[model samples]
Target: MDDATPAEVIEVLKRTGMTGEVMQVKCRILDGRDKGRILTRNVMGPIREGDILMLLDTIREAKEIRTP
Candidate 1:
């Protein structure tokens, strides 16, 4: 039953590096939907593959996303 892992969005500083924290996690998205997912200038992330979406959200977590 193990097929993937949960996407944990985190804040990242290019000048500093990946900051240890979750942004909008736990996150998930199907790559088939947003295969052409655009990365960010602030943080290079938001990975995708099939139903797995590694979201590094800079924008505030919306009601659509589940929060901790």
Candidate 2:
């Protein structure tokens, strides 16, 4: 399962954890059965809106961010 699908970042939700190394974002699947579907995902590294993301799959979704 090395083949990952490409998705476009629709929105940058928030940063995860105190360190802020990961980001939770809303994205759309560019290919496959769930094409055009929007879902939340946790991404690492420097990412922003309108950027492309290679996802492992479309089924798993990231949990909502918690505020303290």
Candidate 3:
């Protein structure tokens, strides 16, 4: 349920953090309150599109990257 819901990564936006280790990705909630909702989130570890992430909650969304 809300403890650890699964969301699929639809798109990988960009790399953030000091060493570009964190990735900004778009996620589509497969269940929970935000099911069928798409949101952007930042994550770590070896991640790619189509990967399933066990999100704690789908409330907070990552801010947009503003690099020029």
Candidate 4:
């Protein structure tokens, strides 16, 4: 996915009552030869981890509206 604007990203979070900045998360590759993982942090703000996860799940749910 393309990089989303700060505003757009925030909007998604807002829907879930998440009003915090976005933080960069880095996971070390267990099967990789690299001994260290380099990660960059950006837009870190106040937000509960659980809330963020919930928001992600909620957003993924497909919704359909039928009008007749």
Index of the highest-lDDT prediction? 2
Candidate 4: list runs displaced more than 4 Å: 1-20, 35-68
lDDT for residue 63 in candidate 4, whole number 0-100? 91
Where is model 3 more than 4 Å wrong at Cα? 15-19, 58-68
How far residue 42's Cα lies from its native spot in candidate 3, in Å, is 1.9
TM-scores, all models, native as reference: 0.19, 0.56, 0.57, 0.20
Tens-place lDDT digits, model 4, residues 1-68: 21211111212222344445464433222222332332223445644222221111113678999999
- Model 1 earns a TM-score of 0.19
lDDT of each: 0.36, 0.74, 0.73, 0.31
Could you arrange the candidates by lDDT from highest to lowest?
2, 3, 1, 4
Clashing residue pairs in all predictions, respectively, total 0, 0, 0, 0
Off by over 4 Å in 2: 15-21, 58-68
Candidate 1, residue 19: lDDT: 69
Question: What's the lDDT for residue 49 in model 1?
Answer: 30
List, residue by residue over 14-63, the lDDT tens digit for candidate 2. Answer: 64555665767777788866688777777776677899877665466879
